[PDB]
Amino acid sequence: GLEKTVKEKLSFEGVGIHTGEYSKLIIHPEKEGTGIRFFKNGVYIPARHEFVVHTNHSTDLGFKGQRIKTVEHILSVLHLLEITNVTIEVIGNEIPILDGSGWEFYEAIRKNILNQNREIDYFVVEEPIIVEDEGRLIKAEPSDTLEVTYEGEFKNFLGRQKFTFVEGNEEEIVLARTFAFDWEIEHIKKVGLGKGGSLKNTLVLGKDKVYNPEGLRYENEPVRHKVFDLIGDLYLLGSPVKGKFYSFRGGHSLNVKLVKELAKKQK
Ligand SMILES: C[C@@H](O)[C@H](NC(=O)N1CCC(c2ccc(C#Cc3ccccc3)cc2)CC1)C(=O)NO
Numbered sequence: 001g002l003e004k005t006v007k008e009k010l011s012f013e014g015v016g017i018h019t020g021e022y023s024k025l026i027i028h029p030e031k032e033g034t035g036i037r038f039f040k041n042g043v044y045i046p047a048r049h050e051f052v053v054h055t056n057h058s059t060d061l062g063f064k065g066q067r068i069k070t071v072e073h074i075l076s077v078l079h080l081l082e083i084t085n086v087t088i089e090v091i092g093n094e095i096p097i098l099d100g101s102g103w104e105f106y107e108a109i110r111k112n113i114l115n116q117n118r119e120i121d122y123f124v125v126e127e128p129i130i131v132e133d134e135g136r137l138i139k140a141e142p143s144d145t146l147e148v149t150y151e152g153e154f155k156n157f158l159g160r161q162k163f164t165f166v167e168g169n170e171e172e173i174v175l176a177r178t179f180a181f182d183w184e185i186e187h188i189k190k191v192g193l194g195k196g197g198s199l200k201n202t203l204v205l206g207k208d209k210v211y212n213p214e215g216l217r218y219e220n221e222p223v224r225h226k227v228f229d230l231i232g233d234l235y236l237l238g239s240p241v242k243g244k245f246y247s248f249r250g251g252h253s254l255n256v257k258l259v260k261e262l263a264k265k266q267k
């Protein structure tokens with residue numbers, strides 16, 4: 001399809017899940033060929049793998065001493081809507097988590113799309129590839145359509161679950177929230193993370209319990225969210241992606257490892 005920007009400036013604000021600080025976003029329209037980039041304290045940070053500085057519990061970007069935490073959800077929404085040219089101005093240190101899903105970003109951006117004059121030059125997976133990390137695995141193969149499967153093997157009541165996104169089913173993953181296991185929270189807080197995490201923005205699960213009074217939005221909400229996360233990390237290739245992906249227990253580190261191998265392959 002055509003390259004796309006936003007019709008007008010779009011604003012979002014709220015707490016960041018990791019920093020726990022309040023931050024504000026301003027999504028600015030941009031001309032054809034600009035690409036997706038962040039802007040903080042006079043510095044432009046392109047939404048590309050070369051700018052990744054952290055991958056543990058979030059994908060973070062940095063350039064010239066300016067850092068932005070948790071870019072995955074906003075990038076996933078922009079990837080799904082095929083917004084190719086925008087500047088995301090960040091007043092703070094992290095993208096707001098909002099309700100833990102991409103819903104608010106998705107709804108506001110989809111109503112404000114401006115089609116542009118050039119076609120999208122997609123990042124097209126040309127051959128099969130596999131990346132691994134001690135049991136964890138991500139594979140990609142050619143496909144005319146973006147298809148993303150995530151399979152989890154949870155150590156609680158959820159057990160094994162699988163979910164596949166295909167083009168046209170964007171609404172099936174944009175409402176799936178970030179999640180956490182109660183036995184892992186102490187470690188996350190000890191490593192200086194999850195400061196803004198709560199039952200208002202995270203689906204919190206125990207061995208046999210759901211902490212959230214509203215419960216799960218879907219029986220497989222965690223794997224739908226993991227698919228949404230991978231689509232965000234795939235946008236670090238610098239263009240909307242065409243390929244069929246399968247992730248078995250993948251995370252941001254393995255997602256970025258795949259992205260860098262795909263980019264190197266196509267140099
Ligand atoms: C999903 C994954 O891929 C990942 N998030 C992840 O690993 N997180 C975010 C949530 C953090 C968190 C959330 C909630 C709480 C809390 C709480 C609480 C518990 C009981 C009662 C009241 C509040 C603590 C840390 C933990 C790490 C993700 O979405 N990456 O894009």
Ligand SMILES: [Zn+2]
Binds near residue numbers: 225
């Ligand atoms: Zn996420």
Ligand SMILES: [Zn+2]
Binds near residue numbers: 056057187188191
């Ligand atoms: Zn950790």
